[PDB]
């Protein structure tokens, strides 16, 4: 089991970490949704599909920088929404094909009234999502740490 | 500086802890706000206003039980909104009168789509707000710990 990103890098069998730079809407008002869709940027595949099945959860999702202080929100995972930053590990998604399937994660962030100005700075870490992978075959328990960075400035018009 | 509640328990000079039971809207839809307004339930006053002016912030806000798991939200403090659970201490509100003035705190909670049924249980701890009071006179820095419980069940229609 391993994952890669859209045009970026990969994290191999065993787990590890990778950076993900995401394009964010450059202007968002108070009460509107910032949507960070990672199902268009993170993809994994099962490496022994005929004998092993891989179970994949979002173990922990964390907010940083401007997203931590100026936003409140949720994370949608395989069609279900949970509070973001996360307070518990999500239910598992099954990966059983050598073809790359998306990691079904999306953050839904809305700015707070006290936000004003550069709510998120470009190039800055905005979230870190952790993909935990297990299986039906052995003791293996692996974390793929995704560090999410902003490609652009986000502004909240005051 | 001291505080009381509406049918009132009190936290005396020096700080301490108290319980607050709050009436909640029994039904809240996804996309709607559950509003917990403590400005109608928590009141404070200055004990030597002719010489001392007291500074009061919301130091920390923590979410519990069903609020922790099925809601995302913000906390409003003196006309500005911040993420709830909190990530930082708020700006200070000034107390300079022996008259009881409300603590200007309100929670604004919205249920997550994966929620359904009794999202908050009656009698359960749903938040803990910490009032920090200081002043311009001496070293005093006192904490008033507010434990917020639901008076009734809150249901999210699935
Ligand atoms: C049947 C012989 C072993 C065959 C799978 C070898 C590779 O194991 C890696 O790939 C596996 C299959 O995707 C994962 O389930 C496992 O946790 C790890 O990521
Ligand atoms: C003629 C000067 C009288 C001075 C009385 C000071 C009394 O201190 C109490 O009341 C002060 C004013 O509310 C508080 O700042 C302090 O923390 C404590 O609650």
Residue numbers in the entry:
A (entry chain B), B (entry chain A): 1 to 158
Paper text:
E. coli clinical isolates express the FimH adhesin, which consists of a mannose-specific lectin domain connected via a pilin domain to the tip of type 1 pili. The FimH lectin binds specifically to mannose moieties displayed on glycoproteins at the luminal surface of epithelial cells. Mannose binds in a deep and polar pocket at the N-terminal end of FimH, in which the amino acids Phe1, Asn46, Asp47, Asp54, Gln133, Asn135, Asp140 and Phe142 create a dense network of 12 hydrogen bonds with each hydroxyl group of the pyran­ose ring except that at the α-anomeric position of mannose. The interaction of the aglycones with the tyrosine gate formed by two tyrosines (Tyr48 and Tyr137) at the entrance to the FimH binding site contributes significantly to their affinity, for example with a 400-fold increase for HM compared with α-d-manno­pyranoside.
To establish a detailed interaction profile of the tyrosine-gate residues and to rationalize the binding affinities of various FimH antagonists, we generated single-residue FimH mutants in which one of the two tyrosine-gate residues was mutated to alanine (Y48A and Y137A).
